[PDB]
Amino acid sequence: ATYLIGDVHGCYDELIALLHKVEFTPGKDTLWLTGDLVARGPGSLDVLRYVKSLGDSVRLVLGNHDLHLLAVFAGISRNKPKDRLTPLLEAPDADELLNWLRRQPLLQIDEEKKLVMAHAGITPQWDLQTAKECARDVEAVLSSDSYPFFLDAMYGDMPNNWSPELRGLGRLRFITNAFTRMRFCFPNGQLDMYSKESPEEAPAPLKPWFAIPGPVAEEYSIAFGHWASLEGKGTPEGIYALDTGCCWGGTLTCLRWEDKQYFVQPSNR
Ligand SMILES: [Mn+2]
Ligand SMILES: [Mn+2]
């Protein structure tokens, strides 16, 4: 069976309880995770240890909090107390865990399922080939010995409009923002990097990225996390918003792909 779970955010107890609910069995089953494995919840260290141990039985995409953790580890960014990352950062296996984390994808594609996953979704300004090329380019910098320089460059809110002509710092910043921070788009597909509210509460003319017809969404189902204020609701056919806000006192959501059956684990907080 194929199971897809939204943002875990250090909620190790809820993750394990949900996996036990579906009797997740590596070797028989595969788990997809939308990223944001870490921060806010208490168990970021246990989450990363467990997810790394799954190997080929897990398909991860990196989220914005996963990248922030790497930036803190590399001395690029300051540690915020509310993220509760210190047990992980001080762990004796931190190097092992974080060198694994930075090698994981930004994009997962299963052609037999016609299924795409990224943390925030797929901008309507990208076709599949462009999304693949952009994921490869950022995965390449994150996997390299020079990854702290990219982590420092990634912070920024511009450019917010895709073009194949983009180059340099702006190109990687857009790619990072599209995969890991996207929520709202202007009508022409341009990213808005400020509004984090639910679609009904956003100011015009902002619309969800998934409300703008895009070539990937027209051919593939898209699963994503990230947008907790969406509460996993309000999406069109073929769009699966799996982040139901577990670390916020919401729920952790698991979707089984074969029958589109949902399983929910209440927050312990
Ligand atoms: Mn999140
Ligand atoms: Mn996120």
Q: Give the Å distance between the CA of 231 and the centre of ligand 1.
A: 12
Cα four-point dihedral sign 195, 154, 117, 85: negative
CA dist list (Å): 187 to 4, 205, 210:
30, 7, 11
Report the SS3 class of residue 216: helix
Method: X-ray
The Cα–Cα gap between 133 and 93 comes to 32
Which ligand minimizes its atom distance to the CA of 61?
Answer: 2
Burial class (CB in 10 A: 0-12, 13-18, 19+), 142: buried
254-266 burial, b at 16+ Cβ within 10 Å, e below that, comes to bbbbeeeeebebe
The Cα–Cα gap between 235 and 12 comes to 27
Which ligand minimizes its atom distance to the CA of 68?
Answer: 2
CATH code of the domain covering residue 93: 3.60.21.10
Q: Give the Å distance between the CA of 203 and the centre of ligand 1.
A: 22
Task: Give the type of residue at 179.
Answer: F
Count up the domains in the chain and report the number: 1
User: What tokens were used for 50?
Assistant: 């467990």
Q: Give the Å distance between the CA of 9 and the centre of ligand 2.
A: 9
The Cα–Cα gap between 172 and 167 comes to 8
The Cα–Cα gap between 124 and 144 comes to 29
Report the SS3 class of residue 209: helix
Q: What are phi and psi of 190, to 5 degrees?
A: -60, 140
Q: Give the Å distance between the CA of 155 and the centre of ligand 2.
A: 14
CA dist list (Å): 246 to 35, 165, 174, 198, 200:
13, 39, 28, 17, 21
Q: What number of CA atoms fall less than 13 Å from residue 210's CA on the CB side?
A: 24
Pick the closest to residue 100 from 54, 33, 31, 150 (CA basis). Answer: 54
Pick the closest to residue 32 from 267, 269, 258 (CA basis). Answer: 258
Which ligand minimizes its atom distance to the CA of 183?
Answer: 2
The alpha carbon of residue 90 and the mean position of all alpha carbons in its chain are separated, in whole angstroms, by: 24
- In which domain, by residue range, is 29 found? 2-266
CA dist list (Å): 104 to 197, 210, 254:
28, 24, 21
Look-up of token digits 């907080």:
269
Task: Give the type of residue at 192.
Answer: D
In the structure, ligand 2 is a single-atom ion and the residues with CB under 5 Å from it are 36, 63-64, 226
